[PDB]
Design an enzyme around this catalytic site. Structure first.
Site, mmCIF file in Angstrom:
data_model
loop_
_atom_site.group_PDB
_atom_site.id
_atom_site.type_symbol
_atom_site.label_atom_id
_atom_site.label_comp_id
_atom_site.label_asym_id
_atom_site.label_seq_id
_atom_site.Cartn_x
_atom_site.Cartn_y
_atom_site.Cartn_z
ATOM 1 N N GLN A 4 0.842 -1.172 0.000
ATOM 2 C CA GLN A 4 0.000 0.000 0.000
ATOM 3 C C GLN A 4 0.886 1.234 0.000
ATOM 4 O O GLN A 4 1.849 1.282 0.734
ATOM 5 C CB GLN A 4 -0.897 0.029 1.237
ATOM 6 C CG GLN A 4 -1.769 -1.205 1.377
ATOM 7 C CD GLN A 4 -1.143 -2.251 2.278
ATOM 8 O OE1 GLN A 4 0.067 -2.535 2.205
ATOM 9 N NE2 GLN A 4 -1.967 -2.852 3.117
ATOM 10 N N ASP A 30 -3.799 1.333 -3.304
ATOM 11 C CA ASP A 30 -4.309 2.373 -2.398
ATOM 12 C C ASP A 30 -3.966 3.830 -2.826
ATOM 13 O O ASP A 30 -3.620 4.669 -2.002
ATOM 14 C CB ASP A 30 -3.787 2.135 -0.982
ATOM 15 C CG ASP A 30 -4.446 0.973 -0.283
ATOM 16 O OD1 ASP A 30 -5.067 0.134 -0.929
ATOM 17 O OD2 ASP A 30 -4.309 0.897 0.963
ATOM 18 N N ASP A 53 -7.548 -1.483 -4.895
ATOM 19 C CA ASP A 53 -8.255 -0.688 -3.887
ATOM 20 C C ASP A 53 -7.844 0.757 -4.009
ATOM 21 O O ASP A 53 -7.526 1.395 -3.018
ATOM 22 C CB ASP A 53 -7.954 -1.183 -2.464
ATOM 23 C CG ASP A 53 -8.337 -2.628 -2.233
ATOM 24 O OD1 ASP A 53 -9.149 -3.207 -3.007
ATOM 25 O OD2 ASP A 53 -7.841 -3.191 -1.224
ATOM 26 N N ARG A 61 -14.748 -3.856 -4.144
ATOM 27 C CA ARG A 61 -14.933 -4.870 -3.124
ATOM 28 C C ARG A 61 -15.101 -4.177 -1.768
ATOM 29 O O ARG A 61 -14.681 -3.022 -1.602
ATOM 30 C CB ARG A 61 -13.783 -5.872 -3.145
ATOM 31 C CG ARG A 61 -12.420 -5.258 -2.854
ATOM 32 C CD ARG A 61 -11.333 -6.311 -2.962
ATOM 33 N NE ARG A 61 -10.069 -5.816 -2.438
ATOM 34 C CZ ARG A 61 -9.119 -6.588 -1.910
ATOM 35 N NH1 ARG A 61 -9.293 -7.896 -1.833
ATOM 36 N NH2 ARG A 61 -8.004 -6.051 -1.445
ATOM 37 N N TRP A 69 -14.344 -3.086 1.755
ATOM 38 C CA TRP A 69 -13.316 -3.039 2.778
ATOM 39 C C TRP A 69 -13.964 -3.252 4.151
ATOM 40 O O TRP A 69 -13.380 -3.878 5.020
ATOM 41 C CB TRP A 69 -12.528 -1.737 2.675
ATOM 42 C CG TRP A 69 -11.338 -1.645 3.571
ATOM 43 C CD1 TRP A 69 -10.653 -2.673 4.141
ATOM 44 C CD2 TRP A 69 -10.647 -0.443 3.950
ATOM 45 N NE1 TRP A 69 -9.615 -2.190 4.889
ATOM 46 C CE2 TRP A 69 -9.586 -0.821 4.786
ATOM 47 C CE3 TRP A 69 -10.831 0.912 3.667
ATOM 48 C CZ2 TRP A 69 -8.709 0.108 5.350
ATOM 49 C CZ3 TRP A 69 -9.969 1.845 4.242
ATOM 50 C CH2 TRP A 69 -8.930 1.440 5.071
#
Ligand SMILES: CC(=O)N[C@@H]1[C@@H](O)[C@H](O)[C@@H](CO)O[C@H]1O
Ligand SMILES: [Cl-]
Length: 299
Positions: free
Chosen positions: A117, A140, A161, A221, A223
C-alpha cells in the site's frame, strides 16, 4: 482558461516565485483562519505534505487549460509504502486534513509501485474539492478516508483498492484508469447510520495504455461490511469482469449499484453482489444539501 501566473492574492511557488518549495509556502500561511491561496509554477516537487491550514486554502497549478488534467505541469511526488511509513496516512504524498481545501490542476503521485500500500493523496476533511488533478499509484492510490469530497475532471490511476475509505464522495467526469488487476473501489462504510456514498458519475473507466486487463478489473470490493458505491451514467471498458464486484470483508452486505452505464464492460447480466436502483443518485444525497456553497460550478 489558461492559468500562467498567480491568481489575485496567491502566494507563489516555483523557480522564479517567492518560495522554492510548496512546503515553504504552506509554512508561510502560519496560523490564520483567513482564506488563502497558493499558485504553483511548473515543476516536479519532491515533497511530502500535510495540509492542515485553519482557513480555506486553495492550491492552483500552472496550466494552459484549467478544464482538464491533461496539460498539468506541476507534479508532487514522494515514494514510501505504508509498512515503511507506519500507517496509510503517513505513506501519503499529500495528506489533506483541512476543511474546505480546493486543489486545481496538480498531479500527485506515490512512486512506490506494486507490492504494498502506498497512498498518493489522503482526503480526511469536509468540503474537499479537486479539479483537473491527477492521482497516481498502484495499491491504495486515493484514500478518500472521511468527509464530503468532490472530484471533477480528474484522473485517478491504480490497480488495487485505489479509491478507498469512508468519505462520502462524488467523482464527476473523471478518467479512472487501471494499471493492474484488482478492484477499483474499497469503501469502508460499516454502519447503517453512515449516510455516505461513493458516486461515480459520467466517468470513463479504462485500462492504462500498454496494459492488457480484459475482464481483470472489478468495480469494487467491500473493505467493510456496508460499502456503498454506485457507478452511473459512465463508460466502462472491457476491463470490467462480468461479475462486476468481488469480495473482501467477511459477512459483507455491500450496497452496490449501476445505473445507465455504457461500454464493453457495462453488460449487467452476469453481475454479482448488486442491488436494484431505478434512478441515478444526486449530489444532495452524496454531499448534502449545501454542496452548492462549496463546489466550483465551472466544471
Ligand atoms: C471565511 C470563509 O471564507 N469561510 C468559508 C465559508 O463561507 C464557506 O461556506 C466554506 C465553503 O467550503 O469555506 C469557508
Ligand atoms: Cl483521523
Amino acid at each position: 482558461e489558461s492559468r500562467t501566473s498567480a491568481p489575485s492574492g496567491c502566494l507563489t511557488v516555483g523557480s522564479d516565485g517567492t518560495y522554492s518549495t510548496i512546503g515553504d509556502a504552506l509554512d508561510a500561511l502560519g496560523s490564520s483562519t483567513s482564506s488563502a491561496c497558493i499558485y504553483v509554477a511548473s515543476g516536479t516537487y519532491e515533497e511530502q505534505l500535510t495540509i492542515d491550514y485553519a482557513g480555506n486554502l486553495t492550491l492552483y497549478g500552472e496550466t494552459t487549460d484549467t478544464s482538464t488534467y491533461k496539460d498539468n505541469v506541476v507534479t508532487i511526488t514522494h515514494t514510501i509504502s505504508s509498512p515503511d511509513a507506519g500507517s496509510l496516512d503517513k505513506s501519503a504524498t499529500v495528506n489533506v486534513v483541512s476543511d474546505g481545501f480546493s486543489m486545481y490542476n496538480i498531479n500527485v503521485e506515490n512512486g512506490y509501485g506494486e507490492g504494498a500500500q502506498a497512498v498518493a493523496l489522503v482526503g480526511n476533511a469536509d468540503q474537499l474539492g479537486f479539479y483537473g488533478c491527477q492521482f497516481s499509484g498502484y495499491q491504495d492510490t486515493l484514500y478518500v478516508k472521511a468527509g464530503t469530497q468532490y472530484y471533477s475532471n480528474c484522473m485517478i490511476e491504480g490497480a488495487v483498492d485505489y479509491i478507498f475509505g469512508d468519505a462520502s464522495v462524488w467523482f464527476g467526469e473523471c478518467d479512472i484508469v487501471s494499471n493492474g488487476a484488482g478492484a477499483i473501489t474499497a469503501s469502508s462504510r460499516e454502519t447503517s447510520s453512515d449516510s455516505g456514498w461513493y458516486a461515480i458519475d459520467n466517468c470513463n473507466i479504462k485500462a492504462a495504455s500498454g496494459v492488457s486487463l480484459t475482464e481483470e478489473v472489478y468495480l469494487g470490493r467491500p473493505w467493510r461490511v456496508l460499502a456503498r458505491v454506485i457507478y452511473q451514467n459512465s463508460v466502462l471498458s472491457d476491463i470490467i469482469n462480468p461479475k462486476g464486484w468481488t469480495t473482501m470483508a467477511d459477512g459483507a452486505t455491500p450496497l452496490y449499484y449501476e445505473y445507465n452505464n455504457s461500454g464493453a464492460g457495462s453488460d449487467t447480466s452476469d453481475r454479482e453482489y448488486e442491488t436494484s436502483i431505478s434512478a441515478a443518485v444526486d449530489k444532495t444525497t452524496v454531499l448534502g444539501e449545501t454542496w452548492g456553497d462549496w463546489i466550483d460550478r465551472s466544471y
